[PDB]
């Protein structure tokens, strides 16, 4: 595969084989009091600063140089330019990759097949702005003349996770907006428990689906429309309560949706990169279009940082390279994302899709199977909650787990004269310090003697109180989690994912891996109907189906 | 370490070396039309059936036999009896491990230091029952004479995740109960945004902490009490709106809560095993104490299953053993929990604590460092949501990821004459079928030809459409997600975690790993006050602190 044959990758491997045991963070920090300055970036966006502190990583200046040389050798800069120039870098689907055009506040032309996309982008944005103002002002009324109080986004995957994560993160900015609800699961619990809390007269449903044929989304959409019409009766009332994020005008009209309330997007918007498009309509409804534009503008800022900054100082590149080091050299299967911010409680879950569906791949551009690792398993919960759930394992288990710790300097809720945020910050800082430093046998012994333990007591407990440390982390600290700042942070990780995928020589922008399960579910659905035993699959699938049929009729 | 020196483990590692490249699930199923019968268990709890189908695992009868031989050699049954008999098996802390006592509905005596714990378990349960009846009926009035409409649990870690997961999972059983809210993060967003939605006249706060010194919980509690008194003014009104769940009578009294408003538990209730105790009070308030007793009864049934069933047919043991196989022979770092149930959306997150804080260890009973893997990273989201997020990596990534797929046969919401649940069941079944079967080059080529692709386009696309398969799963199917059945399922994984801990010779029941971060946060706290530069740590900690101080004063 391309990566394994790359001479800079082999150089990196050889260094790792020879020098791994020099990489002790305590020793590295004791030997270089300038280490923070050498291995951190400060970004001034003009709308807050971002400090990317990567100094608690198992790197030296030589390792960083080797990693930048690998990004050069693997052609990261040229790939980036192909992305931004509208070239068809989604090569298995023959498609451009232009989430960057969605937020191109400069309106610099970006051509696909020699035709600037920016006018179509801005046309949809202008329709979003108009519709948002009509709904939020009370001008748009439901079928009995009431203003909209609840907006229900129905969609799966990329049509769900981004808008949910952002409206959760930007909840303080929703004054004057309707409540937002997200229905994604086909499990009928999800739509049913949502509908039970809503009034049809004042609810607006947003059906998010390019095809308007997606099975889970359209089934949920049909269930919502049945509930709605059980109240309203008149099919013409659907057009006051249902809009579409889609291009299938025919299916949209057939559903009962006025086609001027179809908000379009394009094939070069991947679902897991789509919150910047029409898919973000629920964001703009909730926090207002001005704040949605701020979200776009932050992403645009980070797009320019990624385009103009030398690789050795380029935040998404450096994040990507550190990840390559831990994945392909240390062999770490996972990457933890730990935001110390309750509003970001769905941030890690968003990047499960964005990272794992992008880079959970094993065929390269040439059709060759990889012979190395690709994307990691991403996971996490917000701090400080995760501290009382799983940090025991991060500190004292048998797994090396690279962690990104993120936090805003300024809280949206400075209650108690700042006391809560002060304690939050202190834990953010202490945890990465603890992971780095650990606590030696001698240090733990001293503590146990001071506590008065008997000599046999102390020797018993002592090994359990030792922290081996040397556990690496990134700390990402930013002034305040505003719409602009969130946009910049999300875009940063988008470009990290891109850089990693170029290095591995995979297509970060397709998802052929979802097809087999879809095909097999369609074959099973009709077999569940009626009471006959099923024999057409492997013995386990049959056995499960026949247990299901047996237990359908248990009291 | 003990495990590595165990002769049955060595025989497992040899079998793995000599036959690993022989375990292909398509071939196993083709060779053995009885593979599902031989590699599944059906349990009749008398309150729903449980099918634990472990046949899509990379195992043969010989592996399963070697795995059970390991369980006997590592002494799982004796260790189990020690736990159930009240011995001090939390050996680093000198404590018993008796969450099974909390749900011991048979009231068989369990002695600790020569005294039966059951009378006190039941005294607290009776107190919980009376309190829940009074609050739920409207008998219990707030300071202005109103009934309670909102219950707010303030607690973190083990005093939060359990009660939250269960109230979320059992939301259909909460008709007539007050709304429940969970405040856990120290981040002031969490309490602030909650208090803004509440009326002090009808909100009941529950302060949950064994110790009652958890800094996050006591700070949150003080913030809530300040807010409450801003409206109520009269400090004696606090006894009508605040109760405590703790082991520390004295710390609770020192906070200013009336002592008959304290619901006690005991040092042998680990926080991450504590929802069965007083810590479950918010569950009982929300769904009623009768449904809480069913939850306890479910766990009690699984406790008896675990205690009385031969190892080779014992559900928690078999799950544990399959985990050992994937962790210590295949080297899988992670274990995914994928319930096809939106009500279980917080189940995986609960077992992140239950599994990873228990078995995320590296020192054995003899004080020796392990020289093998211990507990995995647990993660997951409910299906079908996870399906559209990260299954691409499970199918076509470079990682082996043992997955548990869980689903109830009967939905709580049989809308559209069952259509939604039919589709959910189909996806539940197809995904494990797909992970097992894959799709070969030959099969993918035929599909592309049938779809009319040109030879150039076919050959360009073909390798991307191939699924290597052979990815193993458990399927856990149960009649219905009732209070009883949730109790049985949570207990089943508790005992899985116990068995794995005994096999690795670690302590599943301590958590010394959390101390260093707590000590270092206490030192940093005072340093954040005032504008002075901090120089007392490593350069990164200093540099972060000084950036925080710089930017605290920024106007964005």
- Known binding residue B480? Answer is no
Distance (Å, whole) CA A352 – CA A334: 11
Partner residue opposite A193 with nearest CB, options B171, B378, B552: B171
Nearest CA in chain B to A369: B463
- What distance in Å separates residue A447's CA from the closest CA in chain B? 12
Tell which residue, B237, B240, B152, has the closest CA to residue B198. B152
Which token pair is B257? 């809560």
List of chain B residues whose C-beta atoms are within 8 Å of the C-beta of residue A378: 390
Q: How many CB atoms lie within 10 A of CB B545?
A: 23
Chain-centroid distance of CA A138 in Å reads 33
DSSP B485-502: HHHHHHHHHHHHHHHHHH
B342 to chain A: which residues are within 8 Å by CB? 185, 187, 189-190
Count of CB pairs separated by less than 8 Å, A with B: 512
In the block, tokens 């009294």 appear at B253
Chain A, nearest residue to B542 by Cα: A36
Residue A62: CB atoms within 10 A of its CB come to: 10
Asked if the Cβ–Cβ distance from B424 to A186 is below 8 Å, we say yes
How far is A545 from A547, CA to CA, in rounded Å? 5
Torsion angle, alpha carbons of A422, B510, B167, B143, to 10: -60
Burial letters A514-538, b for 16+ CB under 10 A, else e: bbbbeebbeebbebbeeeeebeebb
Residue B377 pairs in a beta bridge with B334
- Rounded-to-integer distance, Cα B180 and Cα B241, Å: 14
Residue B166: HSE in the Cβ half-sphere, 13 Å Cα cutoff: 34
Look up tokens 């049985």; give the residue.
Answer: B488
Cα torsion angle, A36, A38, A39, A44, sign = positive
Render the burial of A326-361: b for 16+ CB within 10 Å, e for the rest. bbbbeebbbbbbbbbbbbbbbbbbbbbbbbbbbbbb
A464 is catalytic: no
In angstroms, the Cα distances linking B114 to B85, B87, B111, B343 are 11, 11, 5, 42
DSSP label of A90: B
CA dihedral B320, B322, B328, B329 (to 10 degrees): 170
Element (H, E) at B163: helix B161-169
Distance between CA atoms of B384 and B406, rounded to whole angstroms?
A: 12
Which of A186, A197, A297 should be substituted to probe chain B, the one whose Cβ sees the most B Cβ atoms within 10 Å?
A186
Query: Cβ A36–B373 below 8 Å, yes or no?
Result: no
CB within 8 Å: B544 and A475 = yes
Determine contact, residues B484/B48, Cβ cutoff 8 Å: yes
Task: Provide the pairing of β-strand B115-116 with B150-154.
Answer: unpaired
DSSP code for B4 = T
- Which residues touch B61 (CB under 8 Å, ≥6 apart)? B38
Which residue in the block uniquely carries the two structure tokens 């670690």? B506
Q: Is the peptide bond before A316 cis (omega within 30 degrees of 0)?
A: no
| Residue A469 region by backbone torsions, left for phi larger than 0, else alpha for psi between -120 and 50, else beta | left
Q: How far is A119 from chain B (nearest CA, A)?
A: 31
The widest CA-to-CA distance across chain A, in whole angstroms, is 83
3-class DSSP assignment, residue A58:
coil
Among candidates B406, B424, B427, which has minimal Cα distance to B415? B424
Using CA atoms, how far residue B165 sits from A121, B180, B245, B278, in Å, is 42, 12, 18, 16
CA separation for the pair B172, B412 (Å, rounded) = 7
Instruction: For residue A417, say if its preceding peptide bond is cis, omega within 30 degrees of 0.
Output: no
Is residue B35 within 8 Å of B64, Cβ to Cβ? no
Instruction: Give yes or no for a contact between B321 and B508, defined as CB atoms under 8 angstroms apart.
Output: no
Q: Would you list the DSSP string of B66-135?
A: HHHHHHHHTTHHHHHHHHHTT---BTTTTB---HHHHT-TT----EETTEESHHHHHHHHHHHHHHHHHH
Instruction: Please state, as a whole number, how many other Cβ atoms lie within 10 Å of the Cβ of residue A369.
Output: 12
CA distance A371 to A1: 6
| Given A201, A216, A357, A381, the catalytic residue | A357
Q: Are B375 and B360 in contact (CB under 8 A)?
A: yes
Helix/strand/coil for A219: helix
A539 contacts in chain B (CB < 8 Å):
29, 32-37, 55
- Residue A186, number of CB atoms within 10 A of its CB: 29
Helix, strand, coil % in chain A, rounded to nearest 5:
55, 10, 30
Which of chain A's residues have a Cβ under 8 Å away from the Cβ of B548?
A: 409, 425, 477
DSSP label at B384?
A: T
B274/B280 Cα distance (integer angstroms): 7
Residue A213 known to bind ligand = yes
Tell me the backbone φ, ψ of residue B404, rounded to 5 degrees: -100, 120
Distances (CA, A) of B322 to A397, B418, B499: 20, 34, 11
- Pick left, alpha or beta for residue A201 (phi over 0 → left; psi -120 to 50 → alpha; otherwise beta): alpha
Closest CB to B189: pick one of A343, A369, A539: A343
Q: Which two tokens stand for residue A505?
A: 């020589």
A539/B423 Cβ within 8 A? no
| Paired sense of beta strands B403-410 and B334-339, if any | parallel
Q: Which residue has the tokens 């994928």?
A: B338
Whole-angstrom distance, CA of residue A17 vs CA of residue A330 = 10
Q: Token digits for B417?
A: 């004459």
Closest CA to A314 of A34, A84, A508, A67: A67
Annotated binding-site residue? A353: yes
Q: Are strands A150-154 and A203-208 parallel, antiparallel or unpaired?
A: parallel
In Å, how far is B84's CA from the nearest CA of chain A? 24
Domains B99-293 and B515-555 share a fold: no
Closest CB to B415 among A188, A462, A540: A188
E-strand ranges in B346-397 read: 377-379
- Cβ pair B233, B253 in contact under 8 A: no
CATH code for the part of the protein at B99-293:
3.40.50.10490
The answer to whether the annotation marks B441 as part of a ligand binding site is no
Q: From residue A64, how far is each of A334, B12, B544 by CA, in Å? A: 21, 42, 21
C-alpha dihedral (A266, A270, A275, A281), degrees to nearest 10: 30
Q: What is the residue-wise DSSP string for B324-345?
A: HIIIIIS---EEEEEES-GGGT
CB distance B392–A356 less than 8 Å? yes
Which chain B residue is nearest to residue A340, measuring alpha carbons? B187
**What letter would DSSP give residue A154?**
E
| CA pair distance B544, A37, nearest whole angstrom | 11
User: Under CATH, what is the fold of the domain A1-98+294-514?
Assistant: Rossmann fold (3.40.50)
Domain ranges of chain B: 1-98+294-514, 99-293, 515-555
Cβ contacts of A459 on chain B, cutoff 8 Å: 367
Q: Do A524 and B430 touch (CB under 8 A)?
A: yes
Tokens encoding B85: 């008999």
How many other C-beta atoms can be found within 10 angstroms of the C-beta atom of residue A508? 28
Assigned token pair, A208: 């998010």
* Block residue for tokens 């100082």: A313
B167 marked among binding-site residues: no
Distance CA(B208)–CA(B263), nearest Å, equals 9
For residues A166 and A292, give the distance between their C-alpha atoms in angstroms, rounded to a whole number.
Answer: 10
- HSE-up of A146 (CA within 13 Å, CB side)? 12
**Does A441 appear as a known binding residue?**
no
Kindly report the three-state secondary structure assignment for every residue of B392-423: HHHHHCCCCCCEEEEEEEECCCCCHHHHHHHH
Structure tokens at B495: 């005992």
Q: How far apart are CA B208 and CA B213, in angstroms?
A: 10
Which residues of B are catalytic, by number? 357, 388, 518
C-alpha span between B453 and B464 (Å, rounded): 14
**Annotated binding residue at A149?**
no
CB-based contacts of B136, cutoff 8 Å, min separation 6: B176, B177, B178, B285, B288
Angle at A269 between CA A265 and CA A273, to 5 degrees: 120
Q: Could you say which of B53, B190, B468 has the minimum Cβ distance to residue A543? A: B53
Residue with tokens 């509690």: B221
Whole-number CA gyration radius for chain A: 26
- The first and second tokens of residue A455, run together, are 């000599």
CB contact under 8 A, B187 and A341: yes
Chain B positions in Cβ-Cβ contact with residue A389 (cut-off 8 Å): 157, 161, 349, 352-353, 356-357
Using CA atoms, how far apart are residues B203 and B197, in angstroms rounded to an integer?
Answer: 10
When CB atoms are compared, the residue of A51, A191, A398 closest to B373 is A398
- Residue B505 token pair: 């010779």
The closest of B202, B168, B194, B161 to B287, measured between CA atoms, is: B168
Q: Which residues of A282-312 are buried (b: 16+ CB within 10 A; e: fewer)?
A: bbbbbbbbebbbbbbbbbbbbbebbeebebe
Closest C-alpha among B421, B391, B390 to residue B407: B421
CB B38 within 8 A of CB B61: yes
Distance CA B462, CA B448 (A): 8
Residue A268 CA to residue A248 CA, distance in Å, equals 16
User: Which of A156, A398, A480 is opposite residue B556, by nearest beta carbon?
Assistant: A480
Give the CA-trace dihedral at A484, A490, A491, A494, to 10 degrees. Answer: -170
Distance CA A442, CA B303 (A): 42
Q: What is the resolution of this structure in A?
A: 1.6
Contact (CB<8Å) B188/A539: no
Q: Any idea what DSSP says for residue B385? A: T
Are the beta carbons of A421 and B360 separated by less than 8 Å?
no
Answer yes or no: are the C-beta atoms of B217 and B160 closer than 8 Å: no
Say whether B353 counts as a known binding-site residue: yes
Q: What is the C-alpha separation between B238 and A93, in angstroms, rounded?
A: 64
Tell me which CATH code domain A515-555 carries. Answer: 1.10.1390.10
How far does the CA of residue A435 sit from the closest CA of chain B (Å)? 8
- Number of continuous H segments (helices) and E segments (strands) in chain B: 23, 13
* Assigned token pair, A57: 């990583």
Angle at B290 between CA B289 and CA B295, to 5 degrees: 90
Q: Are strands B203-208 and B262-264 parallel, antiparallel or unpaired?
A: unpaired
Q: Which two tokens stand for residue B176?
A: 């007539």
SS (H, E, C) A481-505: CCHHHHHHHHHHHHHHHHHHHHHHC
Is residue A288 within 8 A of residue A132, CB to CB? The reply is: yes
Contact status, residue B15 vs residue A508, Cβ threshold 8 Å: no
Phi-psi region of B94 (alpha: psi -120 to 50; beta: other; left: phi over 0): left
> Do residues B404 and B382 lie in contact, with contact meaning Cβ atoms separated by under 8 Å?
no
Mutate which of A539, A545, A548, A553 to test chain B, going by most B C-beta atoms within 10 A? Answer: A539
What is the distance between the alpha carbons of residues B381 and B309, in angstroms, rounded to a whole number?
31
3-class state of residue B259 by DSSP: helix
């Amino acid at each position: 595969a391309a990566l394994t044959r790359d001479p800079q990758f082999q150089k990196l491997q050889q260094w790792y084989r020879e020098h791994r045991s020099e990489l002790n963070l305590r020793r590295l920090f004791d030997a270089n009091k300038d280490r923070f300055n050498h291995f951190s970036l400060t970004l001034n966006t003009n709308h807050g600063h971002i400090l990317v502190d990567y100094s608690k990583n198992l790197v030296t200046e030589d390792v960083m140089r080797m990693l930048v040389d690998l990004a050069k050798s693997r052609g990261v800069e040229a790939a980036r330019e192909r992305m931004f120039n509208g070239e068809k870098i989604n090569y298995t689907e023959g498609r451009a990759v232009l989430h960057v055009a969605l937020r191109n506040r400069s309106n610099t032309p970006i051509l696909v097949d020699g035709k600037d996309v920016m006018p179509e982008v801005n046309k949809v944005l202008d329709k979003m702005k108009s519709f948002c103002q009509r709904v939020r002002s009370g001008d748009w009324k439901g079928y009995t003349g009431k203003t909209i109080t609840d907006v229900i986004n129905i969609g799966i995957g990329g049509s769900d996770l981004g808008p949910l994560m952002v409206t959760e993160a930007l909840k303080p900015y929703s004054s004057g907006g309707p409540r937002v609800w997200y229905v994604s699961n086909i499990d009928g619990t999800h739509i049913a428990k949502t509908l039970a809390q809503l009034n049809p007269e004042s609810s607006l449903f947003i059906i998010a689906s390019k095809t308007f044929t997606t099975q889970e989304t359209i089934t949920n959409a049909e269930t919502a429309k049945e509930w709605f019409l059980q109240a309203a009766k008149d099919p013409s009332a659907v057009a006051k309560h249902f809009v579409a994020l889609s291009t299938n005008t025919t299916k949209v009209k057939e559903f009962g949706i006025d086609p001027q309330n179809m908000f379009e997007f394009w094939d070069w918007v991947g679902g897991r990169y789509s919150l910047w498009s029409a898919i973000g309509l629920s964001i703009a409804l909730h926090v207002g279009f001005d704040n949605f534009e701020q979200l776009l503008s932050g992403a645009h800022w980070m797009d320019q940082h990624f385009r103009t900054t030398p690789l050795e100082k380029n935040a998404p590149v450096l994040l990507a390279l550190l990840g390559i080091w831990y994945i392909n050299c240390f062999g770490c299967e996972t990457h933890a994302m730990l935001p110390y911010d309750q509003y970001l409680h769905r941030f890690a879950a968003y990047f499960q899709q964005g990272d794992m569906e992008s880079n959970g791949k094993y065929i390269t551009k040439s059709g060759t199977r990889v012979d190395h690792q690709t994307g990691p398993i991403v996971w996490g919960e917000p701090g400080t909650n995760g501290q009382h759930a799983f940090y025991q394992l991060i500190h004292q288990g048998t797994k090396m787990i690279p962690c990104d710790f993120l936090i805003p300097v300024q809280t949206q809720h400075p209650i108690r004269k700042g006391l809560h945020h002060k304690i939050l910050l202190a834990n953010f800082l202490a945890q990465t310090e603890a992971l780095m430093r650990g606590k030696s046998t001698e240090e733990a012994r001293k503590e146990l003697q001071a506590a008065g333990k008997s000599p046999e007591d102390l020797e018993r407990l002592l090994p359990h109180k030792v922290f081996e440390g040397n556990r690496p982390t990134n700390s990402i600290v930013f002034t305040k989690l505003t719409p602009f700042m969130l946009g910049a942070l999300v875009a940063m990780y988008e470009h990290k994912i891109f850089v990693q995928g170029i290095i591995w020589d995979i297509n970060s922008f397709d998802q052929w891996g979802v097809e087999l399960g879809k095909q097999l579910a369609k074959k099973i659905e009709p077999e569940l109907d009626g009471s006959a035993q099923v024999t057409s699959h492997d013995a386990s699938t049959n056995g499960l189906i026949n247990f299901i049929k047996q237990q359908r009729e248990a009291r």
